[PDB]
Amino acid sequence: DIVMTQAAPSVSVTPGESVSISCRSSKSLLHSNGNTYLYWFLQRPGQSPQLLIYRMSNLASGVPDRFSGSGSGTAFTLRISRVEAEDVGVYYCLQHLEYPFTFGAGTKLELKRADAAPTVSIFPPASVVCFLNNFYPKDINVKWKIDGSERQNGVLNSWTDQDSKDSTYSMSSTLTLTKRHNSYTCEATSPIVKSFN
C-alpha cells in the first residue's frame, strides 16, 4: 500500500501572499516512462473535488498560473502564488502509480483578513432565529435573552465555511420554544445586539 502524507491539516495565509502545501509518498511516484503519477485536487466548500495539477506540475484547463507544483520523487509541494479569497478549500494529493490508488488526508486553506463585526438579524416565530453574518475571525459567541433573562437551553448553532469572496465567516443561531414572555434578544461578542417584542 502506497501511503500519502499531508502533515498539515490546515494552513493560514494572508491574501496576496504565498503558501505551499506538502505531500509525501512512501514510495517514489516516478515511473520508467519518465512521468510522475501524482494528482492535486481542490475541493471548494460545498462542491465535489476538481483537478488542479497533474504530473510534475501540469495545470488543468482554467487553472490560474498562480498555482504550480514541484517535488522530488517522494516529496511534493503545491505552491499558490498570490493567494486569493476564491482559493479557500481543502487540497488533496493522490497517487495513481499503483493500485490501490490512495489519497492524502487533505489540507484546508484558510485566509487571514481584517477584523470584522457581524451584521445581526433577528426573526420572530415556533422558533426564534438569529443571523450573525460576515464577521471575522471565526471565533464568535452568541447570547440569547428573553424578557431580559439570558436564556441558554434550547439553542443550536451552525457556521458556514470561510466565504470565498470576502473571507468572512457567518453563523446562525436558533432559539426553539414551546409553540408568555416579551423581549427576545440576540447579541454577539458597545455590543452588537438585536431584539424585538
Binding site: 453574518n133 451552525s158 424585538f196
Partner: protein, 172 residues
C-alpha cells in the same frame, strides 16, 4: 461532460443499494469510471474502478466484499452496488471519469449521499423569516439529507432528534 448521480439514497441497515452514474458529453468507453467515498466532514477514499471498453475492474481490498462495479455500455451508465450496509456506509459516493490515455482529463460527478438508517423519510417544512435588508428561510423537520435551496448564506443542517433543521439568509 456529464456524470449524473441521484442526490441521495436512504438505505435500511443490512440491505444493499445500487448507485447510478449516467455519463454524457464524452466518449463513455474511452474513460475509466472510478468510485470514491467521503464521509461527512472527512477525507476521500478510493473504492475501485472499471474501464467500460474492456470491462476490466480494480478493487481497493478494503471494499472487495462490499462493492461491485458494473457498466451498461448501451446506456452509458456505470453502477456500484454496496452490500449489507452498516452505519459506517453512510457517506457521499462520487463517480469520477479519467481518460484512459490523456492524463489531465479527470472529472468528478456531483456525488450521491447515502444515509443508512431504519428511520423514515420526512419532507421538510419551510418557513418565513421576514424583517421583524435580510430575508430568511427556515427549512425545518426533514429527513434524510440533503435538501436544496436557492434564491447568500445557507447554513449546515443541524440534527435535532432524528430530524435535520437548516436555515438560509438573503441580504439585498
Amino acid at each position: 461532460v456529464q456524470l449524473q448521480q441521484p442526490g441521495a439514497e436512504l438505505v435500511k441497515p443490512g440491505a444493499s443499494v445500487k448507485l447510478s452514474c449516467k455519463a454524457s458529453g464524452y466518449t463513455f468507453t474511452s474513460n475509466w469510471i472510478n468510485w470514491v467515498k467521503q464521509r461527512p466532514g472527512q477525507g476521500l477514499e478510493w473504492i475501485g474502478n472499471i474501464y467500460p471498453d474492456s470491462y476490466r475492474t480494480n478493487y481497493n481490498e478494503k471494499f472487495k466484499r462490499k462493492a461491485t462495479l458494473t457498466v451498461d455500455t448501451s446506456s452509458s451508465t456505470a453502477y456500484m452496488q454496496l452490500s449489507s450496509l452498516t452505519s459506517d456506509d453512510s457517506a457521499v459516493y462520487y463517480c469520477v471519469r479519467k481518460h484512459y490515455s490523456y492524463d489531465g482529463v479527470v472529472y468528478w460527478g456531483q456525488g450521491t449521499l447515502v444515509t443508512v438508517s431504519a428511520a423514515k423519510t420526512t419532507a421538510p417544512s419551510v418557513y418565513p423569516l421576514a424583517p421583524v435588508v435580510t430575508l430568511g428561510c427556515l427549512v425545518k423537520g426533514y429527513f434524510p439529507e440533503p435538501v436544496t435551496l436557492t434564491w447568500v448564506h445557507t447554513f449546515p443542517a443541524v440534527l435535532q432528534s432524528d430530524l435535520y433543521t437548516l436555515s438560509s439568509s438573503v441580504t439585498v
